[PDB]
Amino acid sequence: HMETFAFQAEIAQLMSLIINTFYSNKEIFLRELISNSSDALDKIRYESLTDPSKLDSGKELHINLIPNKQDRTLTIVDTGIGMTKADLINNLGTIAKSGTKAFMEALQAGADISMIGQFGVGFYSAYLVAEKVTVITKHNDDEQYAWESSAGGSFTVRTDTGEPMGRGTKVILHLKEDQTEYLEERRIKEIVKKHSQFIGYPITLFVE
């Protein structure tokens, strides 16, 4: 059921750089995950214009931010296009390889870690605040999957048995013990207003 895969040497190096470099502006992780959600939502909305049946799995196009203090998790949920098994194992890793190389060169040339999203590898900014990342996803053409990694050179992929999603992606951030500020209502609201205020989809900040 659960399969284990090795990250490509370039992506393992990217993850080590994110985890090891001293960089206090960690809050940019949220903008990067919301932008990936917005790109996924644009994609399913565009596709539905020529094929309305692509919305049979859900008409609603939104982003939900869910903090859970008992679990120490921050979940970013979207009803976007979702990802297939091939996206999780091969496709996105191929894109991430060229993106990492360009990001690495720019950093040596004086660029900042906040600029990560310009190189299409913004997802890995999750490791600035999370010790473990779980990705639950459902694409129209494939089954529901759970991707997972605590870095260290490997990731796992398995068919997900949890609550069926219909269509979209859930990025669950298992926060580091010193990164619990991102579970606070005031902190999340302040970050969304600062970096993600003009997203073209409704963003609901859930409370506890």
Ligand X SMILES: Cc1cn(-c2ccc(C(N)=O)c(N[C@H]3CC[C@H](O)CC3)c2)c2c1C(=O)CC(C)(C)C2
> 160 a known binding residue?
no
CB of 84 to ligand X, least distance (A): 9
Q: CB under 6 A: which stretch of 32-40, 156-164, 187-195, 196-204 binds ligand X?
A: 32-40
Task: Kindly tell me the burial class for residue 134, based on how many C-beta atoms sit within 10 Å of its own C-beta (0-12, 13-18, 19 or more).
Answer: buried
174: which strand partners? 73, 132
The single residue among 29, 127, 147, 201 that binds ligand X, judged by CB under 6 A, is 147
**59 CB contacts (<8 Å, ≥6 apart)?**
none
Per CB under 6 A, the list member of 10, 27, 32, 78 interacting with ligand X is: 78
How many residues belong to the site for ligand X (CB under 6 A)?
A: 20
Shortest distance (Å) from residue 16 CB to ligand X = 15
Q: Is 80 helix (H, G, I), strand (E, B) or coil?
A: coil
Label residues 113-122 b or e (16+ Cβ within 10 Å = b). Answer: bbebbebbbb
Other residues' Cβ atoms within 10 Å of the Cβ of residue 47: 14
- Binding segment toward ligand X, per CB under 6 A, in 16-24, 64-72, 78-86, 157-165: 78-86
Site for ligand X in 115-134 (CB under 6 A): 121, 123
Give the nearest residue (CB) to ligand X: 40
Task: For the CB of residue 98, give the shortest distance to ligand X in the complex, in Å.
Answer: 10
Tell me how far CA of residue 116 lies from CA of 76, 86, 146, 187, in angstroms: 19, 24, 24, 22
Q: Which two tokens stand for residue 129?
A: 């605040």
**95 touches ligand X (CB under 6 A):** yes
d(CA 100, CA 12): 10
**Judged by CB under 6 A, which of 10, 15, 37, 134 binds ligand X?**
37
Among 14, 30, 61, 92, interactor with ligand X by CB under 6 A: 92
Task: Report in angstroms how near the CB of residue 150 gets to ligand X at its nearest.
Answer: 13
| Adjacent-strand bridge partners of 170 | 77, 136
Contact residues toward ligand X (CB under 6 A) are: 36-37, 39-40, 43, 78, 80-81, 83, 87-88, 92-93, 95-96, 121, 123, 135, 147, 169
